[PDB]
Amino acid sequence: MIKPMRIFIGGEELVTYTSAQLQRTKKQMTGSLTVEIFLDYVPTKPTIVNAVRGKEILVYIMGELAFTGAGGDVSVNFSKGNGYSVTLTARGRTKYLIDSSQTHPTGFFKNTSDKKVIETLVKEHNVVLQWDAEEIDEPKVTLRDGNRIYNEIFERCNQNCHFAYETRDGKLLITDGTNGTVGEDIILGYNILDFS
């Protein structure tokens, strides 16, 4: 079977998704799922809706996890001729770190390490941290008042080289090197549909 995906908003194995795009990246903290559902409407019978705006999903790609984190939005469209589509979007579980606002009481970490300041800037929204780089010590860590849970981390992992992104399980990976795991030797003339 060519079958790659099987999405679960909670257990409901999507069988109507008319299209899909799943993006993962190291340049950022999250990903971006984008499903397209049909959602018919018969204007006499009863109809049911799903107002998820937050109901959690995953995308098992080719019998293996690819994403983990319809939180993004619901975008029910309309038209006369090809209408009644529903674009669902779903960022990564490491999102509230992106759209929140730090609410730690003190604001002044003293004699701490970047790992610790990152553990307390995350465990306010239950995002287990996959620390796999090192422990750097720093005397003064004052967080700008309510800056953003993601700006502060990015600042604290850029002045000591540490890539900050998200894995397939739903965790925050703060690494310093690679994920190992070598693979296919793409050769020109063998599988590249296109290159640039």
Partner: protein
């Protein structure tokens, strides 16, 4: 009818002063509007938006020992700058502007005749400025 005199009922065609003999006469009248198709609805709307611009199409023939000179003169007239007065054989006098004029002229297949397919558009004057 049985005693229908054609050339006493069709007007001799001419554009911008130059007269010629026409072989066909068409028009493209109309009335343009929108079309509403509300979703999930057994009802439809329509909104009249104006007048569709008129266009005329003719076919002129030249079958004379000097058809080449006549066709050259007619080409020189049709390429004159600005719209001019047209006598449509079945619509009378209008103000049109030539938009295309194909000149078919073969030799080893039909020598002697030259055909011109003409395409005019109702060109009404304006008043420079913002009218």
């Amino acid at each position: 009818g049985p005693c229908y005199n054609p050339d006493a009922e069709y007007l001799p065609a001419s554009f911008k002063g130059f007269s010629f003999d026409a072989d066909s006469s068409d028009s493209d009248h109309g009335r343009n509007g929108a079309e509403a198709e509300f979703v999930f609805g057994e009802r439809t709307g329509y909104a009249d938006l104006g007048i569709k611009i008129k266009s005329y199409q003719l076919r002129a023939r030249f079958q004379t020992n000097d058809h080449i000179a006549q066709t050259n003169a007619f080409i020189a007239v049709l390429e004159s700058p600005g719209p001019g007065l047209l006598v449509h054989p079945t619509r009378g006098t209008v103000f049109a502007a030539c938009r295309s004029a194909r000149v078919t002229d073969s030799k080893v297949d039909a020598a002697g005749v030259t055909y011109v397919e003409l395409d005019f558009v109702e060109a009404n004057s304006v008043l420079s400025g913002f009218g």
